Structure 1
Amino acid sequence: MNPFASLTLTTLIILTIPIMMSNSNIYKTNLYPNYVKTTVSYAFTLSLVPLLMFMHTGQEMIISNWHWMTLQTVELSLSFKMDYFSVMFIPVALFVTWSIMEFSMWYMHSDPFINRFFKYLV
């Protein structure tokens, strides 16, 4: 139960790393699409674990980490609903995205802005 929250949040956080690094020198080289593909693959591998936990027990949670603003009697907070739907759809989406990104590294090779294409995909 304790590893569940960490893994579920990391699977989403890791996807933001290529966006952050797009300001660095990696974005200017030809290694960026491969870095993006590897990041997505690692994200899928990490997302497999919460799916295994759910299959084993049925672990479903809600992570209301950041409190954004409270409008009198209404509290709006950054909350993620980690349930059957999310925990199962995340690995499928990441797997498809990984395959698509490899197929794009092949297909969109000639494009002058392939780094932009991969960044938009992420």
Structure 2
Amino acid sequence: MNIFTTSILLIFILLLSPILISMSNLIKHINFPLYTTTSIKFSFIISLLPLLMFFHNNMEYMITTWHWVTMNSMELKMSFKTDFFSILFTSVALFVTWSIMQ
């Protein structure tokens, strides 16, 4: 309940870091393409772990991160559904995007 979710969220954190840099003065100096490629590669490697744990036990989660707004009788949250579909597609897309970046 911890490692899985930790990685599922750290993937997004990594995908975001390049964009938060793009709104900073670092982008002038650092090599941004290589930075983004490395971040994507590391996101892919991290995502490999949920994939393993699912291949093993075949458990899938429902993860509610942030409660946005409660409209009367109807709640809205940023909920994630890490099933076979989502995990496998995440890993595959991250591999392909890692390649496309180079």
Question: TM-score normalised to the size of structure 2?
Answer: 0.94
Alpha-carbon RMSD across the aligned residues, in angstroms, is 1.1
Deviations 1:6-42 (A, max 9, x none): 1111112210000111122332236111000000000
Question: TM-score normalised to the size of structure 1?
Answer: 0.79
Aligned to 2:65: 65
Percent identity, aligned pairs only, is: 48
Larger RCO of the pair (alpha carbons < 8 Å, separation 6+):
1
The structure with the larger Rg is 1
Structure 1 residues 1-40: aligned runs within 5 Å: 1-29=1-29, 31-40=31-40
Unaligned runs of 5+ in 1: 103-122
Inter-partner Cα distance in structure 1 for 2:70 and 2:92: 35
Inter-partner Cα distance in structure 1 for 2:49 and 2:33: 25
Residue correspondences, number? 102
Unaligned runs of 5+ in 2: none
